Design a protein around this ligand. Structure first.
Ligand SMILES: [Cl-]
Length: 299
């Protein structure tokens, strides 16, 4: 069935030359070639797809996994890091960050390898460390890394985490008590209580998301309203980003994120968000207008 396959490879290719904006054709084309072992054409197809489209976490991770295995030396490794840097730009991506962290720990023996690992985890925590269901895996991964080389930094990460509302933060408090020789300070006990209060406050909104059907737009918009009432810029940014993972083809959501950012010392953030907006909703003239106004405003 090689001739059968090659025929449908050529058909999909012709269909892409007819219309490059056919997402499923790209995916179908790439799926074949990975099985067929045409490693060169798979990489080229992935490169071309990723120029045209923002990719989901799953699509990125399939690519990254193949490239990790094929990387043999320090230079190949750097090109894999370049691929991670491209990968993390599209949407918030806790699993890509976890894999970036693990790959970096794999390269610990590179010169500067320790700094690279800590940079990766700190950057991950900056993006997803407040994520109520998915942030905890990154705090735990970072603590397991820091433990495996000591141990004040592990105290730091327990205490930093416990100031933040996350699911299973009760278990982390118990863990920290049992782990710590000394007892936990009062300030950290006080912030933990404040964080538990926050957690309870957010629980109805999280439950609404989990209960509602995908892509749960109304439940996201209500959560966004709620966080915008509360006013923490990091939290507002996070909820927009969570909503956009599932609602990336909704121009109104990007526009709302853009309006919020028009009221902010954050040039790099503003311009990266607008680029992502036009990659996801390229037919929306208002988003292109907004992107160019933002560039002028920040020039
Ligand atoms: Cl880095």
């Amino acid at each position: 069935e090689e001739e059968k396959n090659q025929l449908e490879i050529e058909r999909l290719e012709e269909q892409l030359s007819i219309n490059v904006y056919d997402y499923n054709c790209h995916v179908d084309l790439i799926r074949l070639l990975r099985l067929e072992g045409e490693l060169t054409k798979v990489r080229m197809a992935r490169q071309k797809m990723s120029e045209i489209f923002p990719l989901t976490e799953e699509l990125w991770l399939e690519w990254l996994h193949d490239e990790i295995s094929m990387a043999q030396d320090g230079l190949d490794r750097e090109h894999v890091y370049d691929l991670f840097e491209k990968a993390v730009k599209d949407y918030i991506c806790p699993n890509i960050w976890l894999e970036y962290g693990q790959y970096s720990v794999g390269g610990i023996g590179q010169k500067g390898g320790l700094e690279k690992v800590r940079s990766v985890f700190e950057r991950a925590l900056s993006s997803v460390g407040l994520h109520m269901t998915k942030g905890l895996a990154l705090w735990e991964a970072y603590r397991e890394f820091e433990s495996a080389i000591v141990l004040e930094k592990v105290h730091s990460l327990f205490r930093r985490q416990l100031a933040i509302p996350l699911y299973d933060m009760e278990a982390t408090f118990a863990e920290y008590e049992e782990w710590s020789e000394d007892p936990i300070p009062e300030s950290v006990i006080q912030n933990y209580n404040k964080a538990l209060q926050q957690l309870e406050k957010y629980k109805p909104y999280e439950e609404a998301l989990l209960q509602a059907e995908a892509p749960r737009l109304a439940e996201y918009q209500a959560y966004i309203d709620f966080e915008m009432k509360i006013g923490d810029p990091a939290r507002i940014q996070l909820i927009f980003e969570r909503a956009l993972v599932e609602n990336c083809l909704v121009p109104d959501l990007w526009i709302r994120y853009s309006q919020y950012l028009d009221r902010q010392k954050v040039k790099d953030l503003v311009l990266s968000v607008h680029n992502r907006a036009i990659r996801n909703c390229p037919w929306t003239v208002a988003l292109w207008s907004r992107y160019l106004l933002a560039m002028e405003r920040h020039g």
